[PDB]
Design an enzyme around this catalytic site. Structure first.
Site: not given
Ligand SMILES: *[C@@H](CC(=O)OCC)[C@H](C[C@@H]1CCNC1=O)NC(=O)[C@H](Cc1ccccc1)NC(=O)[C@@H](NC(=O)OCC1c2ccccc2-c2ccccc21)[C@@H](C)OC(C)(C)C
Ligand SMILES: *[C@@H](CC(=O)OCC)[C@H](C[C@@H]1CCNC1=O)NC(=O)[C@H](Cc1ccccc1)NC(=O)[C@@H](NC(=O)OCC1c2ccccc2-c2ccccc21)[C@@H](C)OC(C)(C)C
Lengths: 188, 188
Positions: A40, A71, A145, A147
């Site tokens: 991503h 990933e 931050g 990742c």
């Molecule tokens: C690291 C990359 C970054 O900072 O973004 C720049 C584009 C980042 C780390 C995580 C952010 C929040 N805490 C972390 O540890 N990763 C992400 O943002 C990642 C996408 C990504 C972008 C770029 C490179 C690599 C990865 N997206 C998320 O982490 C996403 N979380 C998520 O989908 O979790 C799954 C969830 C799930 C599964 C099944 C049932 C219910 C749920 C649920 C409920 C509520 C929240 C998440 C999940 C983040 C962005 O999603 C939220 C909603 C937490 C913001």
């Protein structure tokens, strides 16, 4: 206790700051000029490495035989320095782990260590709408931050941080077989 | 190497998350129900400790004999739990140190460790317009969110993080004599 000394040795010799269109990521160098970054991050044909524009000679976005995102993207970089070969620290198989450390190397956090406790072989995760396999989970409130952050136990580099939900953090597994010298295959 | 094990033991047993009108701070508990927090946190007569509203029974904003800010405020809290007494880990004198760790315990970072390298007895600092004395300096790009963070070497708790300029970080010294049992003095 957690293997802080091991995490530090990995960070010292085997990480760089990578920057793509999507922002900064901790980047683990694995061997030669080969490194990993979360898929991503959207790696293109050039990337910033420690703020130096660098050609991406190859980029392979890993997927399993169900054609599902793992990933991990493996990149080959046009740089002079070789990475110390750490393939021997990569696990052969999927596993659960104790007392892991998550280590971050970015502009904002050039060197930071977070004990994340127990790591479980979690399996399927819906990552921001993308079905993803082979995920490791830890009960720690990881943040944006972090990742690419390197997950270790003593003597093992087990994955890279890719996601979180505010309570738990998730890493993509690293396996030894991802990086073995191989043969001839049209991949793009 | 840095004394990560020592930093972790201090964080595990002797830190809480403090929250004032100015935000969250790592808070080091020193003995009994006595803790420290940077003076610029603006402690009032109540404070949140691990999200629980807590009476501040006393608060002493330390200043030296030049009537200059030392940036340490010692607080006495109305809580049931006593802090493990760590006064024996406090340095007697001003000093320079090697290979220090800065440790943070906040909601956003419940447990994080940053090796900051060499720490120098820096002395005078103009902290956001306030002349301040007895400052320790490390060449590390510390950030907002790290104030109150505990600076250690193995076997010594040497200060709490209070400031930075984007390239360097600054801690207020802790000295053993700040916490010795004493006698009778009108202080407010
Ligand atoms: C690291 C990359 C970054 O900072 O973004 C720049 C584009 C980042 C780390 C995580 C952010 C929040 N805490 C972390 O540890 N990763 C992400 O943002 C990642 C996408 C990504 C972008 C770029 C490179 C690599 C990865 N997206 C998320 O982490 C996403 N979380 C998520 O989908 O979790 C799954 C969830 C799930 C599964 C099944 C049932 C219910 C749920 C649920 C409920 C509520 C929240 C998440 C999940 C983040 C962005 O999603 C939220 C909603 C937490 C913001
Ligand atoms: C911790 C508390 C917090 O996050 O604020 C909530 C109110 C925070 C940590 C530091 C922020 C930047 N990096 C850090 O490590 N500390 C402060 O913000 C602190 C005030 C404070 C508030 C609450 C509790 C405890 C403390 N203020 C600063 O750190 C201030 N830095 C500063 O004054 O440095 C001195 C500088 C100096 C001296 C002599 C010549 C030239 C300079 C110079 C040039 C450029 C920058 C700084 C200095 C911050 C806020 O100032 C800048 C300009 C960096 C934003």
């Amino acid at each position: 206790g957690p293997g802080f000394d091991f995490a530090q040795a990995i960070m010292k010799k085997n990480t760089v700051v990578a920057r793509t269109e999507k922002g900064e990521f901790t980047m683990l160098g694995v061997h030669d000029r080969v490194a990993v970054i979360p898929t991503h991050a959207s790696v293109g044909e050039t990337i910033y490495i420690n703020d130096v524009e660098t050609k991406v000679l190859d980029a392979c976005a890993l997927r399993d035989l169900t054609d599902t995102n793992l990933e991990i993207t493996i990149v080959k970089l046009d740089r002079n320095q070789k990475f110390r070969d750490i393939r021997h620290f990569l696990p052969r198989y999927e596993d659960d782990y104790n007392d892991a450390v998550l280590s971050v190397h970015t502009s904002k956090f050039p060197n930071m260590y977070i004990p994340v406790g127990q790591v479980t072989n979690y399996g399927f995760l819906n990552l921001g709408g993308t079905p993803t396999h082979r995920i490791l989970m830890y009960n720690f409130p990881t943040r944006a931050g972090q990742c690419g952050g390197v997950v270790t136990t003593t003597g093992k580099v087990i994955g890279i941080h890719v996601g979180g939900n505010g309570a738990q953090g998730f890493a993509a597994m690293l396996l030894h077989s991802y990086f073995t010298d191989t043969q001839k295959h049209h991949h793009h």
